[PDB]
Amino acid sequence: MIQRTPKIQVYSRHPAENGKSNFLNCYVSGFHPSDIEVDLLKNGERIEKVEHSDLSFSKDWSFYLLYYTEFTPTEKDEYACRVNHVTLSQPKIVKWDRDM
Template sequence: MHSVEVSDGGSVKRSMRFGFNGKDYISLDPDRMRWIATNHFAVMTKEEWDSDESWNNYWETQLHGIFVEHLKRYLEAGKEYFRRKVQPEVFISRREPNRQDKPLTLSCLVTGFYPVDIEVTWLRNGEVMSETQSSGVRPNHDGTHQIQKEIEINAGDEDQYSCQIEHSSLAEAQLYQWGKGLECVC
């Protein structure tokens, strides 16, 4: 397996490793062009590969040239796609407790957004609250993302809570409340 990462600043990070039987076997230090045995079975392979100049020249050309150029070409071809901004859709739902001594749950599902960076916060009368549960950001089938955050509250307090969304596709933070037609209550 090989990987090449090019940062926004232009720095390049490369890695190369081989596995065998589901386990790491040997990896390459691309800066020194030296092989690293990841277990005692790979020591002989490491010694053989370190001494094979044509083998190392091949991988140096691949990692420092060809793979980087391919990645840059792919990024250039897809730059409009990667730089796009898609506004999230927000859905707030309410789940009744399954027992009388339990609180009810408000859920804020934020979906269809791109890029991935987003802040979703529950507020009570404008004060930040800690959510009870978060799904974390997950991918959607169309290349966008979603996240769901839940908070447990006392019945009858729903109108005190709002879900705040901050995302690069939005000019400013948006607030959504249960029972307000799910329109922004900006």
């Protein structure tokens, strides 16, 4: 029963521009089993309206999921993605970077 650690990407649908409405995305893939819990934080808290795609997998049977929510990038606010999976001793947090 192989267990793979989830890959995490945190990005924006469009190139970020402070004050301009945008879409924050968190793509978690290559994980197994499919049991997991993704959450979007904004300054240390969780996001209310957070939708995700339907469970699916890739060629090598690796599961992938896309969580997403609307957000307006600023110079002060911090956005991040938190991932809880069995292959993780503690919830992994990936901070959003407009350069990635």
